[PDB]
Structure formats: structure tokens, C-alpha cells
Design a protein around this ligand. Structure first.
Ligand SMILES: Nc1ncnc2c1ncn2[C@@H]1O[C@H](COP(=O)(O)OP(=O)(O)OP(=O)(O)O)[C@@H](O)[C@H]1O
Ligand SMILES: Nc1ncnc2c1ncn2[C@@H]1O[C@H](COP(=O)(O)OP(=O)(O)O)[C@@H](O)[C@H]1O
Ligand SMILES: [Mg+2]
Ligand SMILES: [Mg+2]
Lengths: 463, 489, 463, 129
């Protein structure tokens, strides 16, 4: 009824068992005399199972006793996890006391069937108006921030965190393993001071912990997001949830880590990987059912300055939208600093969103592209010599690029500005009006940090 | 004991069974809990097997039994307008399917004496394929390109176009996400093309064994009409995923690895499937039907899809698949992002059947236009450096530009035989020379609309009969000349 | 004696015999109760021989008995095989009943000695323009076609069959062509209606057969060619039988497919360890002894379209005339797509072809090689920059590249233009006139699929 | 303040031990765990709070914040930062100092390229002056 450790090689721990009681795949076992828990991965015959240690490893010796829980690893999930930080097993680490939630779920579950898929393709609306018009997201999609370390990516995550609550009353989950660069306060404090802390649940893990801890974190985040989505209100409907799975440091590692979101190990099981069956369900677990929709935002690095096709593109296979952070525009100070041209989305099509949005969104990219191509000749020889036909193009491009800037509610406690949450239809109306040229008389500086069009005209009249 | 057995090893969907001395190669096995396997590796003291379905409820020491039958799927005419998985179990929840027959999944193709040449056309609605790279009933052809190059758009458009023809169609999805499959099914149902289509879906959330056996079951379902004198058509969403699943299965099962980290018999894997598409002769139909039907010739068409990395055609696998089929259609990213849609490379795409799989009018008209396009492309590439040119080179360049613009078409807008004939006749005769390089896309649409509003009996005659009598060409010339003058865009 | 099956993996089957009745190498065996036969490949001691099954291995299990024939696979050879189609073991598959022939020969036999090797002295016209000039043929020789998939090898093979075999009398030709069934069924039919099936024998295997059948197809055809040439009618000869194999590569592909299962370690690119000897033992037997003559044409596949692959590189040494097809020329519209450079023939000597022919060929190759090196200069600096002595070379190279094109009799279904035939003297006259600077005013668009020079003049006049 | 004279040589030594331990070579120049070998080391340099200092010291020290700074050195071949090891350490550090060789041979010493050498915490550490 009790086993013994047989072979400790790296993270792989082969454990034998009695003949009539051998743990089924994915079962969890507890090692007496130490803090560590084992997860079953594959069976090897002769009553021997190959497992991976989950807790921190210390002073392990051959032949240690082990007792079986007979059930998968269950993580506490509920409403009390909001504003807390937990271990990979759900044990809190923020010194704030135990989590009072009493219900838990297994972290290894099956995919929703073909009969549980949604009957349409809806667009998730966020507060940010650059992202919404140019790179629309999709409820159940997969997002990639292709952003380098220098730009302020975190404030974008915070703005999403705040707006989903307000926009759709949907909770969020954050999971990440370690930190790549330190240029500002650690996320926890940077979220505490902005008061978005109670709308999110956080799972974290270092690198000096065993490779088991580094793995199986996205699964815990996914289980929490699933519980948030499935919970129903008095109207008998679910919520829309965002899963912020942090990149694992570098993309070389993210090659495995991107594929870790696709269920691939970074050489944890060097003999016989077990991913085809574990992986590939991970890509599915993220979907929009009729009741609730869950979406995934993942950050990645672009050191070569090469993204998409220039980049390895292995990420490009499954990503539905790519958000690009530009250092030049950030130097400009237009925050959020998102490139309006390089960022792309597959949901920008005449069928999914309609012909109106497609016609409006496609036109602004053309004007931006033309302005970017003539900026050099404008620089060398000046604006005056340029024909008036292109001068209108330049003026309109400046207006839209200024309008892309937006006050953020998460930074209100610092700047003091009232902040804005611009609905999508109003963004469409304002962009169509600007493209047609009704706002031509409107002077500049009425779009920088001015939020919504009516606020544009209010700013114009107030000065 | 010869049928009983145990389980000694479970990992990643492979179950290795002791005993089972009386076990054939490919014969199914029964697991505890309504789960079926497939014996693929037979050894000195063990039997390899792949599990069909979820294997997480299998442990060591369980029991297994041998059915004594090969893997088979239900087959018939009642499967039309339904959605099933790789074993034929319905998933759309529209009630059980009233099956009457079963057919083996692993079967050899008809011999050489029992076949026939292919002389009947298959329409697609695309000007490029129907005029430059013809397809016919019984011909196998491939769609090759990168990711997000419109490869699947061409496959569905073809399925929709087979409305009045009377060809049953099949669709197989391998490795795709559930949302995309649902969207495709919705599009099929909306257009009314689901009344004869059957869909087999082995999604990414399914075991590699399911993603490996999908095309075989699709072909077995499609052969029902071929063996009885009725045409059929089958589409494979992506065979690259099937190759990956096979490499997985043959590596988890201990088999020596090979070139490119791939295993042996990948060529055999992709060839034993495609060769099952054939056009049988009336004698074969009569012998198979036991005299029930006479004077009928069966057929079966295939359109497998393969994706490539970095847009290269000289990769080992793409060439291994090109060497099997009777043609290929190449889709280029550089043409896609440049606004040329559908992006088809004239020089690298060929058809081996040729003019045999065409109507008389199209074959008489669409002659020597693909080679002219390739010659134009090379001439333009050279002439970008040439300082001066003459009349002949300029004429060839203008004709090439106009033709490459005429071949662009929208999605979900299938042209008919009369439309293609009129467009190609106008192009060849030289009425598109004076028109600007731009506004060509408007020209063909406006001309088709005019020739549909008036001259309707001529189009009816051309649609029903593929004959191209002098009267037909005289009428087309008179109509195009009437449209040229006294008529504006 | 009788043995039993003890192991089966795909095609490779090893059968364990008694202590003293172990069958020798290549001693075909019959499996009782099934239409399958086995051939010995290698010995493993202990009374175990690892074999390959001829036919499908589906329907068989471990434990079945086998009877040793103690003789290699013998095929029927004689005058009665003429006009018949047969599978590799020699079973007729034309639904025409059995074959009345008692003479039988084994397919495994040694190679002719050094003493009985005969020279080749007589040319052999074929009607193609590029082949008759840059690569002359000779009776009793060996010819090979090198190409990547989709470049036209077959069409050229069918044109050669139609252009020499149908005219030469008493040929007693042999067909070992293996290709997509559609192409085969058409051949048998085409040959029949032309009433030339009387003096032709055929052996055909498809692509769908297991590796057992694909491995030994060529040996059967070689045996049927060897019998015919050797025999001598009273006061007569062997009929100079001609062999055409369209399936040489599959031999090596099946070899490398099963090599790993026979235990052989990987070599080079991964090709089998014994590639060279395996290719040699087959490629040697196709020769002309002092007792007869054989004229053979082969098709050589080029994997991945590189000629440095170990498979096509080994075959260069075994041929007299080599024809190399390039993908780029095919994509440019020029047919047949033969690389003027990298194509050579042993019979291109001033003593064999003559004096004028040699000078013409050398001058043509020199002009093309000079043009191959002027592309980069034209790119970086204008065309105008290069001197006139190189303008002439560029224009003559372009004209020569198109003039080596002609339409075929066989390939009229594709283009729809009537076929053509050109004798050698016309080729020589036209190329002599071209290199001389005459025909320098004719545009290069009149040299395309125009065949003979006077046709060039007429086509240029029509423009 | 800790300085590692060369970290690429540590990677080479780790590769030697791994290859002598009969582990598979893989398709890359170095094994895949070199990344974690460097990350587990560079993660241990950080500033702690005053409360942690008091907690660890059992109240002996109060109102003082600990610290630790790392200045590892990485060797490149012909200025190739696209190799395996150089790109693993660039992406887990808060700054880079790029010393060229063309400037070094041209007399400009120290040779620091300001165009590509950046800092992340810069402007906070500097004194007011
Ligand atoms: N004729 C067309 N005109 C314009 N856009 C087109 C056309 N055909 C396809 N597209 C675009 O390309 C998309 C189709 O891409 P496709 O299905 O080839 O992608 P994929 O991911 O490579 O395919 P698969 O589903 O096999 O994985 C359409 O959604 C549309 O955006
Ligand atoms: N003389 C020719 N004229 C026109 N087209 C040709 C000619 N030779 C080859 N082709 C084209 O090249 C392709 C080559 O096909 P085939 O030779 O059968 O395959 P492979 O080159 O692999 O043997 C054919 O589909 C045909 O369209
Ligand atoms: Mg797709
Ligand atoms: Mg070929």
C-alpha cells in the first residue's frame, strides 16, 4: 500500500508499487518525512510508475515511503482567492492568512465537446480604442503581446484588468513563473497601489524551485479561470474571463514555454515525453461555450527586432491576434504605446465583424502607411513644398495618431485625470467622421489624452 | 488465452499487451469499458496497440479480447448531411444514423486492368483552375502552400459548386480546432450544400490515433458511390497533421527514427491512401453489382492539402507528396499579400490529365495560356534590367499583365461554364487590349452581367451542352461586339 | 523442412527453421494457406533467417507454417510472354489466361566477366534537337534521365519509345515502366490499338504494394531482357531487345525503408549503409556482351531537387549518356527542360561524331557558360555598361535557349499543337547558322516550340 | 557586489560534464538546460526590504536594507549576439554594456557604444547632482 523511491534522475522520480494497487495517470502522492508531492506521468510495467516531484526538493534519499491521495491535484477555487497570491498547489505565500474557500477542482479535466461550442463569433470589447478598431479580439481567442522589455506593457495589462470588470463584470487570473527584467515595482505592489488588486487571483513560481513547480502553473490558472467563467448570476449566464499567463523569461525558453502553453516540456522528461495526451487539450480548454467565454493573453520577447514571419513564427501558428509595442511611439509618449500598423488580427474580416468596421478600419491603415512613407521627404524638404492633397493626409494621420492616446483609470491615482472608457460604437463613429473630414476644422491637441469624440469637441470649445 | 490478454504498459496513448498469441495485423481489440484498440506491432513476446479514444481509464492488469474482425465503418446514402467522428459515431446530436452496411477501412485499390481513362470534367468555379489546371472525375490533385494563404477557401468553394452536378462530397478535418469546424459546418448549412455533404471531424483535442485514421475512413465512405456508378469527391483538410501524428505513433512505439527525425514508410503511408481514388470501368461496376446496374462507370476524386514552411517546394516531404498525385496547385504568400487572390503560381502548378478532363469549348479555347504566363513572368523579370525594348516584347508584357489581372476572383462567387468561356474568348480574341490595366476586374463582371441579362438562350445552350459549333462562336463574337459599343460600365 | 513465424513488423518477417534445413539466401518460401511468398534477406544464426514478404502481411499471425522451395524466384521466359502483362512473380494480370512456357530462369544471377565485354560503335538518332547535338546516343549503351518531380521525365520517355522503338524492326522490346496506374493502363491500351503489342513484353508493379514487391520488380525485367538477347535464331540474332525501366529509384527507396528494420545502422544522409553495392549489382547486369546487345533507357529521380544526394550521385558513374532536367527551365516555359550544361555523352569525341559536330557542340556550350556569369554584372550596373561583345553573347544565349525547344507528338493533349520531328542534319545546319551571327535579326519569340529553322523563318514572318 | 570573470566558460564546462554523462547531444550547440543554469544564478541578486532584514536578524538590525549587485561577463565571437548563450543572458538582465573592438583598436578607450548599451533602472540610481 506504500511505495519506495527507486531512481532519482533530474526531475524524473520512478516509484514502484504493490501489484494490486498502482496509481492511475495524473494521480498525486504524498512523501512522508518531507515536503514534496509527486504527479504520475506514465506507467512502465512491473508495478512501476514514472512521476515528477511537485513540492520543493530537499535531501531526498532512495527508498523513501510514499502514501497515495488516489485523486488528481485539486486547487482551491472560489471568490475568496480574489486579491491573493498562492503557490502552484494553491498554498498562500503573501502572509495574509489562509484562504477560506472550501471548494476545489481537479486541474486535469477534459475538453468541451463539439456540441458545447458557441453558435456565433462575438468580439470582446475593451476600453482601449486603438486595440478595438485595429486588432479586434475574439471571445475565446488567443492574444500575444509582442513587446520588448523597455515599453510599458504592464499598464496595458492593468487597463485590461480594470475594464473587463467594468465592461463585462468578468474576473481575471494571473499566472507566471519568475521575472525577466526589473525596471519598476514588482507586479504585486504595482497592482496594490492601483487598487485593481481585488479583481484578480495570482499564482507565482520561482526558478530555483524544482522543475515541477515551473511546470503545471498554467493549468492552475486555467482551472481558476474556468470556475470564474462557469459561475452563474441570477440571470442564468456566465462571465467572460481573461487569463494572463506571463511569459517564462526569454523566448528561446519560450520556444519551450510558448509550447508549454501548448503543453510541451523544456526537457523535464528526457526519456519518454508525455505531452501529446496532456498537451493539445490545453489549447482546447480555452474556448467560448454558450455559457461563458475564456480568453488568453500571453507576452513574448522579440530581441532580434523580428516578429511574426521574421520571428520563428512557431508562436504564429496558434495566435489569433498580435499586439505590438513600439519603442519609438513610447518615446513619443503616446501611452498605450501600441503600433497601429504592425499589430494584426485574424478577426479583422468583412464577415466576422461586418463591412462597416472593415471599411473604416482598413482606410486608416492606408493613411498611416502613406504618411509613414512620406515622412522622410517631409523631413528632408519640408511640408510646404508638398502638394495639398498629401497635406490633408498628413494632418488626418496626425489627428488619428494623437486620438489613439487615451487616459487610463488605473493611472488616475497618479495623474489625477478623470479617465475614460470609450465604447466601441462611439470609436467607430468618431473614426468615420474623422476619415470623412468633418473634424478638419477641429484643431490639434484636442485629441491627445482627450478620450471620446464628444470630449474632443468639448476640449476644442474649452480652448 | 489465445483471445484473452493483459496490459503491461500505458503511456501517451500506446498500450502494450501480453498474450494475444492469436492476433492478426490490424484486427481490433476490446478493452474494459467499451474501448477498442488496433494491433499494429507484433513481437516475439508482446503486442503493440493504439487506443481509439481516451485512454486515461486503462491500467495494468486489465483484460482484453480479440474480435476477429478488421476495423470497419458504417457506410450508405443515409450519411449525407451529418457530422461524425473518425469511427462514424454521430456528434451533432441529430439522432442515430440508420446504418445498413459496413465497409472495411483498410483495402487495396482496383487493379490496372479494371480501370479506365478519365474523360469527364469537374467544375470548381475558379477561372484559374478550370482553364489552366483542369480537374476531372477520377483525378488526384494537391493544394500546396503556406499558412493563411487561402488553401481551405478553394476546397470549400469546390464543394459548394457541385450543386446541380450530382456528385456526393465528403470533408475530413484533421487537427483543426472545434470552433473552426463549427464555423465551416455553419457555412455549409447556410448555403444549402449540406444536403449531400458528409463531415468527418477528428479535432486537435482527439488522440493521435483518431487523427491518423480519419482520411482512410473518409475514403471508405466515399468509395460507396464509386463502386456503384455514381461520382464522389473527397477533401483532406491537411495531411501534414496526419504525418505528424503518424511520426508520433511510430516513435512512441519503438521503431528506428530516420531522415528529418521522421520514420520509415511515410511514402507508403501517403501512397496507399491516395491511390484508392480511381475511375473503374463498366465491367467492374457490373461485376461488383452482380448485374443490378449496367453501362455505368464509377469515379472518385481527391483534393489533399499540404502546408509548407518558409514557402519552399524543394523540401523532402512536399516533393514526396508531389510525386504521388497527378498535379499540384501552389499558393504563394508574396502574391497573397500583394492583392492577387486566389494566389496561384502558373509556372510551378501543373495538371497531368490535361485537356481530357474538359468540355469541348473550354479545351478549344484555353490552350497554351499557362506557359504564356510563365514566359511573361520570366520576360518581365529579365526586362526590368533591359534598357530598351521593341514592339513584340511590349505586346507580350501587356498581354501578360491583362491576363494576370483577369484571373483574380472573389470568394463565394463561383463562375459557370458560360462565364468562363465568354471571359476566355474575350481575352484571347484581343478585346481587352485597349482597356486600361486597372478596371479590368470591373470589366469581366460587367460583361458577365450583360451576357446574363440578354443572350440568355445562348448561355443555356452553352451550359447544358459543352459543344462549340461555329454558330456558338459567331454568336459570342457578335454579342461581345454589341457589348463593346453603345454600352457603358 | 517447415518453419514458423516468430516476429512480424510491417514487411519484415523472420522465420525460424530447423537445425540442419536452414534455406540458403534468396530461397523463396511458400506460406501455406495464403498467397504470400517470402524471400531470404539475411541470416541471424540460431536457425533464424530474416525475410521480406512478397504481398500484403495483413491476414497473417505468428505461428503459421512455411515450406521451403530451395530455389530463387523463377519467372517464365520465352517467346510466349510476348504481348502479355504480368506481376512480379510472373502471374498474368491481363485476364487472358495462363502463359504456355516451360523455360524458367532465376532472377538472381552473377554479372558478366571482363572478357565478354563489347564496345559500342554505332550512333542512334532519336529526333530530339538537344539530345542529338549535345548528347549523342549509341546502340548497346546506357542512357539515364535525371529530374525532380514534375519536370517531364515521363513525357520524354514516351517520346523516345514512340520515336525509335516503333520503327526499328525485330526489336523484341521489353517494358519495365512503373508509374501512376492511370499512366500505365493508358499505355497498355495505346500499345494495343497500334497493333505493336505482338513484339513487346510487360512487367508492371504499382506504388501501393508493400515493400516486398517494390524491391524486386526490376530484377524480373532484367531476367526477361537477358533471355531474349542471349538467344539466337537459326542463322539469326537475339533481336537486339530494348529495355525501358521507369522505376529505378523505388529499388533504393524500398531498400532504405527496410534497412533499419534489418538492423543496419544509419549512414550519410541516412541512406542505407550498403547503397553503392546494392546499386552496382543491379546496374551492372544491364550491359551488351559479345553474344548480343541491349539498349536501355532509365529514369532517375532526384530527391529534394539536389544532385549531390547520395542516391543520384552514385548512379552517374554507371551510365554512358546522362540527361539532366532542371526545375527552373521547366518553370520558364521551355520544353523539353534539359540543362544544356551538366549534360554530356561519352560518344562526344572528334573521332566518333566527326569534326563539325564537335566544334558546334563546344561553341554552344562555351556561349552558354559565358552567359551564365554575366547576370550579376547586369544587375549591379546597367545592361548598357557591358561591352558589345557580351551583348552578342547574351542575345545568342537567349536565342539558343529557346531554339532547343520543340513540340512533341505525345504531349499534344496539354498544349494542343501538332507534334514535330527533326533530323540531325537540320539541327547541325541551324545551329551552325545561328552561332555564325546569321538569324541575328529574328526576334527570340520566334524560336519557341517552332522546331526546324525554316519553321523559325515562317513563324518570324507571321509576326 | 559580485563579478563573474567569464560565464561562457562555465557553460562550456557544464556542456563537457553533460556530454561525458552520456546525455543526448540535441540539435543546438549547447544542451537546453544552460538557460536554467544561468537563470538560477542571476535570479539571486536583488534588494530586500527593511522588514525582511529585521525578520532574519531576530531584531538585531533595524531600518537597514540589504542589497546585492551582479556584473557578469559574456564572451562573443566576431560580435555575434545571435548565438545560443549570448541571447539567453541578454533577455534576463536589466541592462547591457556593449564594448566594441573596432573602437578599441581605434584608440577610443574605454570603448563603449552608447547606441546599443542601455539601462532599465537608470535615472533612479543616479544622485541628484
Ligand atoms: N478569394 C479570397 N479573397 C480574399 N480573401 C480570401 C480569399 N480566400 C481566402 N481568403 C482569406 O484567407 C482566409 C483563409 O485562410 P486559410 O483557410 O487558407 O487558412 P489556414 O490556417 O492556412 O488553413 P487551414 O484551415 O487548412 O488550417 C479567409 O478567412 C480570408 O481571410
Ligand atoms: N513536351 C511537353 N509539352 C508540354 N508539357 C509537358 C511536356 N513534358 C512535360 N510536360 C508537363 O510536365 C509534367 C511532367 O509530368 P511527368 O513527366 O508525367 O512527371 P515526372 O516528370 O515526375 O515523370 C506533365 O504534367 C506535363 O504537363
Ligand atoms: Mg485553419
Ligand atoms: Mg517523378
Amino acid at each position: 500500500s506504500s511505495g519506495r523511491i527507486i531512481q532519482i534522475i533530474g526531475a524524473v522520480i520512478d516509484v514502484e508499487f504493490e501489484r494490486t494497487s498502482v496509481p492511475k495517470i495524473y494521480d498525486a502522492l504524498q512523501v512522508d518525512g518531507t515536503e514534496t508531492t509527486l504527479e504520475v506521468q506514465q506507467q512502465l510495467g512491473d508495478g512501476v510508475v514514472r512521476t515528477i516531484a511537485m513540492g520543493s526538493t530537499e535531501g531526498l534519499k532512495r527508498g523513501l515511503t510514499v502514501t497515495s491521495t488516489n485523486a488528481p491535484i485539486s486547487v482551491p477555487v472560489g471568490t475568496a482567492t480574489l486579491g491573493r497570491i498562492m503557490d502552484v498547489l494553491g498554498r498562500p505565500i503573501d502572509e495574509a492568512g489562509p484562504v477560506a474557500t472550501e471548494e476545489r477542482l481537479p486541474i486535469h479535466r477534459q475538453a468541451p465537446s463539439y456540441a458545447e461550442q458557441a453558435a456565433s463569433t462575438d468580439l470582446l470589447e475593451t476600453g482601449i480604442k486603438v486595440i478595438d478598431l485595429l486588432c479586434p479580439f475574439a471571445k475565446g481567442g488567443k492574444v500575444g503581446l509582442f513587446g520588448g522589455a523597455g515599453v510599458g506593457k504592464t499598464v496595458n495589462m492593468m487597463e485590461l484588468i480594470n475594464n473587463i470588470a467594468k465592461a463585462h463584470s468578468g474576473l481575471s487570473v494571473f499566472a507566471g513563473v519568475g521575472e525577466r527584467t526589473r525596471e519598476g515595482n514588482d507586479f504585486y505592489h504595482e497592482m496594490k497601489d492601483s487598487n485593481v488588486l481585488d479583481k484578480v487571483a495570482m499564482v507565482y513560481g520561482q526558478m530555483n524551485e524544482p522543475p515541477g513547480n515551473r511546470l503545471r502553473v498554467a493549468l492552475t490558472g486555467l482551472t481558476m479561470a474556468e470556475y470564474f467563467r462557469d459561475e452563474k448570476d441570477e440571470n442564468g449566464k456566465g462571465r467572460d474571463v481573461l487569463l494572463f499567463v506571463d511569459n517564462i523569461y526569454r523566448y528561446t525558453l519560450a520556444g519551450t514555454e510558448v509550447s508549454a502553453l501548448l503543453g510541451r516540456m523544456p526537457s523535464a522528461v528526457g526519456y519518454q515525453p508525455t505531452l501529446a495526451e496532456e498537451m493539445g487539450v490545453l489549447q482546447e480548454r480555452i474556448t467560448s461555450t454558450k455559457s461563458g467565454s475564456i480568453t488568453s493573453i500571453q507576452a513574448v520577447y522579440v530581441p532580434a527586432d523580428d516578429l511574426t514571419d521574421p520571428s520563428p513564427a512557431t508562436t504564429f501558428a496558434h495566435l489569433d491576434a498580435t499586439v505590438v509595442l513600439s519603442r519609438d511611439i513610447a518615446s513619443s509618449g503616446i501611452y498605450p504605446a501600441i503600433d497601429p500598423l504592425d499589430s494584426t488580427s485574424r478577426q479583422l474580416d468583412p464577415l466576422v465583424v461586418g463591412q462597416e468596421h472593415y471599411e473604416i478600419a482598413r482606410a486608416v491603415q492606408n493613411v498611416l502607411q502613406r504618411y509613414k512613407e512620406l515622412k522622410d521627404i517631409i523631413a528632408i524638404l519640408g511640408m510646404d513644398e508638398l502638394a495639398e492633397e498629401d497635406k490633408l493626409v498628413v494632418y488626418r494621420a496626425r489627428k488619428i495618431q494623437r486620438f489613439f492616446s487615451q487616459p487610463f483609470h488605473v493611472a488616475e491615482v497618479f495623474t489625477g485625470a478623470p479617465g475614460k472608457l470609450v465604447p466601441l460604437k462611439e470609436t467607430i463613429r468618431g473614426f468615420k467622421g474623422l476619415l470623412a473630414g468633418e473634424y478638419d476644422h477641429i484643431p490639434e491637441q484636442a485629441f491627445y489624452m482627450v478620450g471620446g469624440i464628444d470630449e474632443v469637441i468639448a476640449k476644442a470649445e474649452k480652448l | 488465452a489465445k483471445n484473452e490478454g493483459t496490459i503491461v504498459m500505458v503511456s501517451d496513448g500506446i498500450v502494450r499487451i501480453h498474450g494475444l498469441a492469436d492476433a492478426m495485423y490490424g484486427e481490433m481489440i476490446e478493452f474494459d469499458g467499451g474501448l477498442f484498440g488496433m494491433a499494429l506491432n507484433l513481437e516475439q513476446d508482446s503486442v503493440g496497440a493504439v487506443v481509439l479514444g481516451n485512454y486515461l481509464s486503462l491500467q495494468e492488469g486489465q483484460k482484453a479480447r480479440c474480435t476477429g474482425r478488421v476495423l470497419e465503418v458504417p457506410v450508405g446514402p443515409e450519411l449525407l448531411g451529418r457530422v461524425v467522428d473518425a469511427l462514424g459515431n454521430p456528434i451533432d446530436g441529430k439522432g442515430p444514423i440508420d446504418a445498413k452496411l459496413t465497409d472495411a477501412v483498410e483495402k487495396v485499390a482496383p487493379g490496372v486492368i479494371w480501370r479506365q481513362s478519365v474523360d469527364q470534367p469537374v467544375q470548381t468555379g475558379y477561372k484559374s483552375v478550370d482553364t489552366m489546371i483542369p480537374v476531372g472525375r477520377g483525378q488526384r490533385e494537391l493544394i500546396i502552400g503556406d499558412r493563411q494563404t487561402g488553401k481551405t477557401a478553394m476546397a470549400i468553394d469546390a464543394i459548394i459548386a457541385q450543386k446541380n452536378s450530382g456528385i456526393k462530397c465528403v470533408y475530413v478535418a484533421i487537427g483543426q480546432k472545434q470552433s473552426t469546424i463549427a464555423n465551416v459546418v455553419r457555412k455549409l448549412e447556410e448555403t444549402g450544400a449540406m444536403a449531400y455533404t458528409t463531415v468527418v471531424a477528428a479535432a486537435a483535442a482527439d488522440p493521435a490515433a483518431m487523427q491518423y485514421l480519419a482520411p482512410y475512413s473518409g475514403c471508405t465512405m466515399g468509395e460507396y458511390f464509386r463502386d456503384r456508378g455514381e461520382d464522389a469527391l473527397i477533401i483532406y483538410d491537411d495531411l501534414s497533421k496526419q504525418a505528424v501524428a503518424y511520426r508520433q505513433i511510430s516513435l512512441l512505439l519503438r521503431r528506428p527514427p530516420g531522415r528529418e527525425a521522421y520514420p520509415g514508410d511515410v511514402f507508403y503511408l501517403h501512397s496507399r491512401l491516395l491511390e484508392r481514388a480511381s475511375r473503374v470501368s463498366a465491367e467492374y461496376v457490373e461485376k461488383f453489382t452482380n448485374g443490378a446496374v449496367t453501362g455505368k462507370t464509377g469515379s472518385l476524386t481527391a483534393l489533399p492539402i499540404i502546408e509548407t514552411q518558409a514557402g519552399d517546394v524543394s523540401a523532402f516531404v512536399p516533393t514526396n507528396v508531389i510525386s504521388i498525385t497527378d498535379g499540384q496547385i501552389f499558393l504563394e504568400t508574396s502574391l497573397f499579400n500583394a492583392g492577387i487572390r486566389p494566389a496561384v503560381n502558373a509556372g510551378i502548378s501543373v495538371s497531368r490529365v490535361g485537356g481530357s478532363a474538359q468540355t469541348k469549348i473550354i479545351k478549344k479555347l484555353s490552350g497554351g495560356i499557362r506557359t504564356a504566363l510563365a514566359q511573361y513572368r520570366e520576360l518581365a523579370a529579365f526586362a526590368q534590367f533591359a534598357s530598351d525594348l521593341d514592339e513584340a516584347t511590349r505586346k507580350q508584357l501587356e498581354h501578360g499583365q491583362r491576363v494576370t489581372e483577369l484571373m483574380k476572383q472573389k470568394q463565394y462567387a463561383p463562375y459557370s461554364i458560360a462565364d468562363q468561356a465568354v471571359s476566355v474568348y474575350a481575352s484571347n480574341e484581343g478585346y481587352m487590349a485597349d482597356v486600361e490595366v486597372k478596371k479590368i476586374v470591373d470589366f469581366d463582371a460587367a460583361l458577365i452581367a450583360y451576357f446574363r441579362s440578354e443572350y440568355a438562350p445562348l448561355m443555356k445552350q452553352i451550359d447544358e451542352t459543352g459543344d462549340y459549333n461555329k454558330d456558338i462562336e459567331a454568336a459570342i463574337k457578335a454579342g461581345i461586339e454589341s457589348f463593346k459599343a453603345t454600352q457603358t460600365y
